[PDB]
Design a protein around this ligand. Structure first.
Ligand SMILES: CN(CC#N)S(=O)(=O)N1Cc2ccc(Cl)cc2[C@H](C(=O)Nc2cncc3ccccc23)C1
Ligand SMILES: CN(CC#N)S(=O)(=O)N1Cc2ccc(Cl)cc2[C@H](C(=O)Nc2cncc3ccccc23)C1
Ligand SMILES: [Cl-]
Lengths: 296, 305
């Protein structure tokens, strides 16, 4: 029993974290094989880059100074070729995630990991992270079997306190740019398929007060959900919730009627899994994984 | 900016997790140097759990009855001994991945990271706190016994908890790494229940100071309180008594934000009376009690917004 916001074990990622210094700027880099990946803002970026030499980039792995033997830019990421391959490089892939997907963040300062937390890519492409100055270059990831899938690299904080970053190929999540200019997160919405997954997790853990005898159509549910700034629920979301629907005996549209009643009438002094808000940062897969004990 | 429930990086602990098998029971062990630490109930059957005589069960076992697996390698057990509710299995190989470590016994209200494991393999990491009733509100399934709780301030791992059992309300009980249980619990299938739980007051105050540091003051008021009047009110909402030690511990956060501890106490009294009225504090509609004053200082910036 129990339901916690759970991150993947961070060990495979910890052995890749390094410190990158260029002039006055110090941030984090990801050392995989003989390449260190970091935000290009550590340095027109091609005009700034052409003026730099390999020796201008100071890379530190623990108490060892790595030697930079080459450099190149790919979108908003800088790739520093080093003369030593990371002996701790895990099996890995670079993957781009969609809004509503969750991942673990290993927050680092000066190339040293300080914490791990779980979070979700918001529909507005920002993440509600916990980062201070020096956290740039911290990475987001998932683990599937023994393979680390790197999906996020931290670049900046927006004026509302939320965060923005790129995939490991340097493409931003969101309409953001890596420069000091007027940028703002768009109006955000609630990840509906995730709230439904979290309601199924509550039923699995014995919390059933919100269940009712009613059902709804997908169209009527979406008309109601659009009114509360909830993301539209698609037939794909309904299909994805199939396993949890069969385990608990509550049809997806049956749980949608519960969600509609919670949205129109509130919780009324009651909580669900120790929360007085509807939680949207657990995917259907996270719920199945935490209620089954999948290991890495 | 931001404030998340943050766990310590688990790598140093992952390299210590092993699987321990004794007959039909399989659970997790912590391999540090040449010793594997695990719950002594690994030698029990489910029948034995009503009134186990661990000393009588243990004397009947030999070193080769304990199967220890580290990754895909079988470790050889060369000795065994019991210390309170933990079994210490001497192995013939020292763990080359043993970090710098200490065994520390924590007090209620203290937080720690849990590396939940099944079959000696880590599945997840989460942050939690020792409740005032000595239980933990964890996320554990069957096979999670032997999973450990820890803190890593600097490069030293301080092991503070080993998981032993789930109580009927879904909460969890366990021991320090010397095998002493937290609370009035026993490693027996006896009628045991968690006592009435309370809110960790010093932690809610720390979390209110974190909210002020991150730029939110809507909950503050122009009032102050004596420590005695605050405790008389707090006890009525099932909040733990606030001691002079707690007030002393909140000193640094008080000096950083410019808000006296008893003035923050007055704001808490008002929040308990009024609720949040549709508002949130650090993205939560409930008062959070699983961040200590130390966690707030570690995570938050040194410059108030
Ligand atoms: C006003 N700025 C951000 C804020 N507030 S700033 O500090 O001047 N900043 C400007 C800027 C612009 C573009 C890009 Cl890609 C990065 C940055 C930097 C940035 O965003 N850094 C930070 C990242 N993550 C958490 C941070 C918490 C605090 C400070 C800074 C953080 C540096
Ligand atoms: C009724 N039991 C617990 C429950 N429900 S039990 O499974 O029969 N259980 C009895 C028992 C008694 C004392 C001691 Cl020291 C250990 C145990 C075992 C135990 O607590 N195991 C588990 C630990 N942590 C989470 C668990 C979630 C699910 C199942 C089992 C878990 C085995
Ligand atoms: Cl303590």
């Amino acid at each position: 029993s129990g339901f916690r916001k759970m991150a993947f074990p961070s060990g495979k990622v910890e052995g890749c974290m390094v410190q990158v210094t260029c002039g006055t700027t110090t941030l984090n880099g990801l050392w995989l094989d003989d390449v260190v990946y970091c935000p290009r803002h550590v340095i027109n970026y091609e005009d700034l880059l052409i003026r730099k030499s390999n020796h201008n980039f100071l890379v530190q792995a623990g108490n060892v100074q790595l030697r930079v033997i080459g450099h190149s830019m790919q979108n908003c990421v800088l790739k520093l070729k080093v003369d030593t391959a990371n002996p701790k490089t895990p099996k890995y892939k670079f993957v781009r995630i969609q809004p509503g997907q969750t991942f673990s963040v290993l927050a680092c300062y000066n190339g040293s990991p300080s914490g791990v937390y779980q979070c979700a890519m918001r529909p507005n492409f920002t993440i509600k992270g916990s980062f201070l100055n020096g956290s740039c270059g911290s990475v987001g990831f998932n683990i599937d079997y023994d393979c680390v899938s790197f999906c996020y690299m931290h670049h900046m904080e927006l004026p509302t306190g939320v965060h923005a970053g790129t995939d490991l190929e340097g493409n931003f999540y969101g309409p953001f740019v890596d420069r000091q200019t007027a940028q703002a997160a768009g109006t955000d919405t609630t990840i509906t398929v995730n709230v439904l997954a979290w309601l199924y997790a509550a039923v699995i853990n014995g919390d059933r007060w919100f269940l009712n005898r009613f059902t709804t159509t997908l169209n009527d549910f979406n008309l109601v959900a659009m009114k509360y700034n909830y993301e539209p629920l698609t037939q794909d979301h309904v299909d994805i919730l199939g396993p949890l629907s069969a385990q608990t005996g509550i049809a997806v549209l049956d749980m949608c009627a519960s969600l509609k009643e919670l949205l129109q009438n509130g919780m009324n002094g009651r909580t669900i899994l120790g929360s007085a808000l509807l939680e949207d940062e657990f995917t259907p897969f996270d719920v199945v994984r935490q209620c089954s004990g999948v290991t890495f």
